[PDB]
Amino acid sequence: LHKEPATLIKAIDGDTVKLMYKGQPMVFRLLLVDIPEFNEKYGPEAAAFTKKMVENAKKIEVEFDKGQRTDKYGRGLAYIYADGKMVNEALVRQGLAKVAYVYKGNNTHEQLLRKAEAQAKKEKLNIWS
Numbered sequence: 310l311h312k313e314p315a316t317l318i319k320a321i322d323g324d325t326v327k328l329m330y331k332g333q334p335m336v337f338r339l340l341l342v343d344i345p346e347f348n349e350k351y352g353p354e355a356a357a358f359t360k361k362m363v364e365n366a367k368k369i370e371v372e373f374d375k376g377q378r379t380d381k382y383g384r385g386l387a388y389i390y391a392d393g394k395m396v397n398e399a400l401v402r403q404g405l406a407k408v409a410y411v412y413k414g415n416n417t418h419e420q421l422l423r424k425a426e427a428q429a430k431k432e433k434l435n436i437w438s
């Protein structure tokens with residue numbers, strides 16, 4: 310897998326962000342995660358976490374997996390990086406997302422995220438509290 314450049318257009322919520330990628334606006338959906346909805350416990354905290362991460366970043370990068378790159382809604386499916394730190398992993402490590410939507414070909418970082426989820430769950434963090 311390889312990181313590619315992108316620039317933030319707008320934070321949206323815990324697991325979606327609008328990025329300019331190859332000079333076109335796209336909504337990206339974070340691979341391998343599921344978050345509480347905006348009116349469910351921790352929904353707002355997930356949105357705030359991802360917002361700060363992407364807004365404070367000097368450099369955002371998009372890393373597609375091996376399989377499909379857009380979903381049925383036209384959203385990009387990627388691992389997103391903020392100054393080299395993966396947003397998908399950080400959200401999970403904080404107990405603000407669960408590992409989810411693991412489709413065979415687009416699961417390169419599954420075990421990395423599952424390790425983060427186990428740590429959040431041992432810590433009883435947030436959704437695991």
Ligand SMILES: Cc1cn([C@H]2C[C@H](OP(=O)(O)O)[C@@H](COP(=O)(O)O)O2)c(=O)[nH]c1=O
Pocket residue numbers: 338339340341342343344380381386410412415
């Ligand atoms: C994360 C992800 C979601 N999706 C689709 C499955 C779900 O379809 P349904 O809408 O039919 O439930 C939807 C979940 O996204 P959200 O969690 O953003 O709603 O996005 C993919 O198809 N591939 C993926 O990798």
